[PDB]
């Protein structure tokens, strides 16, 4: 249900009680509400929400027009949510509590054109027994005269990375209201300064 | 058709099978089977009451068509010229 | 074949269209059947006649007569099944109107009746199922018995009053 947008700032050490908890700092800047998607007026229930602030000199006339309807301030990023529909704007306070589990999603770092050993784990071949197919290079791709063809959606070299990724059940260690900061036990995908979306625990234990 | 153009037609010169009698303006009487002469629909047999008169226009020679045959892998290729002859008749009857 | 049908004075039989509606003091009860099968109240009692005399008309005849009889007896006196909790340490409680099963399982078994059926516990080792519709009753009690099938060694669980269960005996 509820959630917000922020920036991955980094990972650091942090003891809680008597144990060393690795955490990942996230800036959940205040998020304005720019549009209310009513199912009646649209077709589904949702809320549009903005993040990084932009200079009006950089904002398209149309986009300015959009922002004027609610009249907050031009922002660089907009996204939507579900079942979320409160009043005012979207600060992580009251939203997330320390101890609550959360689904943290973002765009991974991408690795470009990675082989199969990297991409799909694979296993490649013997490095000593006399080859020409060391490191990677896959084995075969099919069978033979039967379906003389390779299966749709199979394991080959490709673009690894740049994917939407959602990690589930992360613990909210600490929350600094006013500094608009939040700490999350463990690692979140994507790079520092990356966009992250922190959503309520969807289907949890 | 098969021979002899019946039906209702408003003075038109058509082209059908030859009509033996060579020449021109040879009165050609034909039996009817249907027609809308004066918006009066008349079926067969009864139509025998009315008959079509036509005059021969010219004895034209058909359009040139080459007759080709072929069976693969056995050779057999055949090529021969052909044009089926006719005559034009000017319809002008009851 | 079945004809004699006991129709008292507290019952109301309505053969309107295909939906046959029966009114009574214990509550009204609707019972659907066929349209090709003739059925009405001739004089005092109720007589059910069949079109053909082969099989596709007699089966449904018996069926229908039976069902109707059940509706009547249902709105006249009502149906009630008597169960029994036999075994060691077996018992059942009551919460409002739901039945609380306690029979060897770690956590008690809550069973919530549907709309028209009611439980009763006049004794900690005996279950009473009361209801209007006989079918429903049967099905709910059936669910109660389904919780612990009498084992072929001691015969525990649920049983109908004087059920004859033969113990195989292991040793």
């Amino acid at each position: 249900m509820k959630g917000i947008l922020g920036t991955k700032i980094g990972m650091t050490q942090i003891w809680k009680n008597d144990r060393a908890i690795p955490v990942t700092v996230v800036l959940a800047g205040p998020c304005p509400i720019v549009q209310r998607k009513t199912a009646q007026t649209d077709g589904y229930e949702a809320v549009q929400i903005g993040y990084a602030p932009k200079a009006e000199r950089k904002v398209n006339k149309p986009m300015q027009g959009h922002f004027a309807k609610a009249g907050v301030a031009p922002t660089r990023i907009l996204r939507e949510f579900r079942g979320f529909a409160p009043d005012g704007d979207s600060v992580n306070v009251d939203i997330f509590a320390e101890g609550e589990k959360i689904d943290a999603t973002g765009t991974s770092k991408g690795k470009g054109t990675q082989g199969v050993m990297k991409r799909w784990n694979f296993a490649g071949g013997p490095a000593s027994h006399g080859s020409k197919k060391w490191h990677r290079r896959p084995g075969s791709i099919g069978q033979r005269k039967t379906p003389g063809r390779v299966y749709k959606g199979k394991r080959m070299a490709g673009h690894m990375g740049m994917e939407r990724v959602t990690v589930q059940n992360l613990e909210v260690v600490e929350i600094r209201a006013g500094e608009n900061l939040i700490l999350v036990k463990g690692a979140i995908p994507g790079a520092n300064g990356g966009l992250v979306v922190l959503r309520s625990a969807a289907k949890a234990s | 058709i098969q021979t002899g153009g019946k039906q209702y037609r408003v003075s038109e010169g058509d082209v059908i099978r030859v009509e033996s009698l060579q020449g021109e303006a040879g009165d050609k009487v034909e039996l009817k089977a249907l027609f809308v002469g004066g918006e009066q629909t008349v079926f067969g047999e009864d139509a025998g009451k009315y008959t079509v008169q036509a005059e021969v226009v010219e004895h034209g020679r058909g359009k040139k068509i080459y007759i080709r045959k072929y069976k693969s892998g056995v050779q057999y290729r055949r090529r021969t010229g052909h044009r089926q002859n006719f005559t034009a008749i000017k319809i002008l009857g009851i | 074949g079945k004809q004699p049908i006991a129709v008292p004075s507290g019952v109301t039989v309505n053969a309107q269209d295909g939906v046959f509606k029966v009114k009574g003091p214990k509550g009204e009860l609707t019972v659907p059947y066929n349209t090709e099968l003739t059925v009405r109240q001739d004089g005092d009692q109720l007589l059910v006649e069949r079109p053909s005399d082969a099989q596709k008309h007699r089966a449904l005849h018996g069926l229908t007569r039976t069902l109707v009889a059940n509706a009547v007896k249902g709105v006249s006196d009502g149906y009630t099944i008597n169960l029994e909790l036999r075994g060691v340490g077996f018992r059942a409680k009551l919460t409002g109107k739901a039945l609380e099963m306690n029979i060897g399982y770690s956590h008690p078994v809550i069973i919530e009746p549907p709309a028209g059926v009611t439980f009763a516990v006049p004794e900690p080792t005996r279950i009473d199922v009361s209801g209007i519709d006989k079918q429903l009753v049967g099905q709910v009690a059936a669910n109660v018995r389904k919780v612990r099938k009498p084992d072929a060694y001691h015969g525990k669980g649920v049983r109908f009053v004087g059920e004859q269960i033969a113990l195989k005996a292991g040793k």
Partner: protein, 59 residues
Amino acid sequence: LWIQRINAGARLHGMNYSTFINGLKRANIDLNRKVLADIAAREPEAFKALVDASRNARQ
């Protein structure tokens, strides 16, 4: 082609192609057969008359 038109015509009144042609066989009267399609396509009234004739030369 011609057939495909003829049975359509037939059907526009309450008969079919089988019934219709057959209702011209029973009567040596109508022996059009060829061109009939053109008649059902251009002159509807005429073809109606033919249908009516077919029914009249049947039952």
